[PDB]
Amino acid sequence: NAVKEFLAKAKEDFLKKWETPSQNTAQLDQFDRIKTLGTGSFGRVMLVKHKESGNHYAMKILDKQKVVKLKQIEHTLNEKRILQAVNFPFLVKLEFSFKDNSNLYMVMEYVAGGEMFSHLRRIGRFSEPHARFYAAQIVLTFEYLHSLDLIYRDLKPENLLIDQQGYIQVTDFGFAKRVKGRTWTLCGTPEYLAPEIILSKGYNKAVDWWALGVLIYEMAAGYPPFFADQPIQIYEKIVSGKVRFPSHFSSDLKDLLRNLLQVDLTKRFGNLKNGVNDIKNHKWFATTDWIAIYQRKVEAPFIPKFKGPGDTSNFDDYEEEEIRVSINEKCGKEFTEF
Amino acid sequence: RGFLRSASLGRRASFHL
Ligand SMILES: Nc1ncnc2c1ncn2[C@@H]1O[C@H](COP(=O)(O)OP(=O)(O)NP(=O)(O)O)[C@@H](O)[C@H]1O
Ligand SMILES: [Mg+2]
Ligand SMILES: [Mg+2]
């Protein structure tokens, strides 16, 4: 009952901050752009420093005209609404939020380690204790996000950020959605799609547990379990239900992946009667102290290079381009809701 | 567990239609 009431109290903070969302609470002159952390068609992510507080934050700017053009406002609606209503040690904290002419802004806590993708690719493959450390944080995050009826729908190393102490900070909530029944929106990444999403059928929260099985596989092997020359061959492999494990996979890891990467929805872990405890009690997490992970008392097996503050040594410099501002408010009526 | 190709190991991009 000690954990059953904690999540019940977390659902109260959620629904409270959910029905009446936050409002604009800063000006763009408070933060100067130091360097570009990321970019895309919808917008960009810059490293900005608080001129009134002397600290760094992560400012994600989104071009308002482009968001209307790419048919993504609802995804910006839900992402902004979910990121202010949730609170978890492994989720990113939306420090500030303020709309402006031609742009929308989201000031998040600056994660100094970058994506897990770069570290995994650089290192090659994580060890099972190293991967078990990262998998546990995802399990406790999926357990808390599922209690709030939320589905993440885009789990991949490109959207997992390693903070300063070696822990995981989840960022991209573009396809996040609060839903109690089922959904039918085809979204994600081909290598990480569950077989039901591929067969154009209705899917539920169990697709987040298929992604966990793919994610653990990629961390422990260095490559995803379903890859091919053409995306159609990837969709064929996923629905086929055949997974080949590397030589160095422990028998316990092979068992957990066979339960997670289960094409049969009625036998997949996390979607059974016992719920999330199917995975936390597995013999692979038999060295994991879950409460110590949540309290963040477990020593990290890997620490990102953080010799000094403001160092983007773990990110890519890209090209530095300023933000185009207008005198005419490009804010559509929907952007009032943000 | 096949012959690894560099294109599959690059940064994957999300999608929705
Ligand atoms: N809080 C943050 N701290 C540090 N870097 C961040 C933060 N938020 C975003 N980034 C960087 O910005 C990049 C883009 O993040 P993201 O929000 O997923 O963009 P996107 O809209 O999803 N486009 P995509 O590249 O397809 O994911 C990430 O890969 C990080 O490198
Ligand atoms: Mg992303
Ligand atoms: Mg995205």
- Give the closest residue to A110 by CA, choosing from A167, A53, A154, A161: A161
Nearest to B12 among A187, A189, A244 (CB): A189
Distance (Å, whole) CA A261 – CA A210: 5
Supply angle C-alpha A222, A187, A79, rounded to 5: 100
Strand partners, A58: A47, A108
Please tell me the distance between residue A38's alpha carbon and the centre of ligand 1 in angstroms. 6
Longest dimension (CA), chain B: 31
Experimental method: X-ray
| Helix boundaries (H) for chain A | 4-19, 64-69, 73-85, 116-123, 128-147, 195-198, 206-221, 231-240, 251-260, 277-280, 290-294, 333-337
Distance (Å, whole) CA A328 – CA A31: 23
Please tell me the distance between residue A172's alpha carbon and the centre of ligand 3 in angstroms. 5
Task: Convert A294-327 to b/e letters by CB count within 10 Å (16 or more is b).
Answer: beeebebeeebeeeeeeeeebbeeeeeeebeeee
- Give the closest residue to A141 by CA, choosing from A240, A45, A270, A21: A270
CATH of domain A21-114+306-336: 3.30.200.20
User: Please, are residues A144 and A199 in contact by the beta-carbon 8 Å criterion?
Assistant: no
Annotation says A154 is catalytic: yes
Q: Which two tokens stand for residue A39?
A: 């970019």
- The answer to whether the CB of B13 is under 6 A from ligand 1 is yes
Q: Which string of DSSP letters, residue by residue, matches A89-131?
A: TTBPPEEEEEEETTEEEEEEPPPTT-BHHHHHHHH-S--HHHH
A261-267: which pairs have CB atoms within 8 A and are 24 or more residues apart? A261/A210, A261/A213, A261/A214, A261/A217, A261/A225, A262/A210, A263/A195, A263/A238, A263/A239, A265/A196, A265/A206
Radius of gyration (Cα) for chain A, nearest Å? 20
Residue of A63, A100, A154, A163 marked catalytic: A154
CATH of domain A6-20+115-305: 1.10.510.10
Q: Which two tokens stand for residue A167?
A: 């822990």
Domain ranges of chain A: 6-20+115-305, 21-114+306-336
Q: Which two tokens stand for residue A335?
A: 């952007």
Letter for the amino acid at A154? D
User: Please, are residues A255 and A245 in contact by the beta-carbon 8 Å criterion?
Assistant: no
Q: In what order do the strands lie in the sheet with A56-63?
A: A31-39, A43-50, A56-63, A103-108, A94-100
- Give the closest residue to A90 by CA, choosing from A294, A287, A279, A292: A294
**Which of B5, B6, B12, B17 best tests the A interface by mutation, with the highest count of A CBs <10 A?**
B12
Note which residues in 1-17 of chain B have CB less than 8 A from chain A.
1-2, 4-5, 8-9, 11-17
- What are the chain A neighbours of B8 within 8 Å (beta carbons)? 191, 223-224, 227-228
User: Please, are residues B6 and A179 in contact by the beta-carbon 8 Å criterion?
Assistant: no
Nearest to A175 among B1, B13, B16 (CB): B16
- What are the chain A neighbours of B15 within 8 Å (beta carbons)? 187-189
Q: Which two tokens stand for residue B14?
A: 């999300």
- What are the chain B neighbours of A246 within 8 Å (beta carbons)? 1
**A232 exposure class (CB count in 10 Å sphere: 0-12, 13-18, 19+):** exposed
Nearest to A223 among B9, B16, B17 (CB): B9
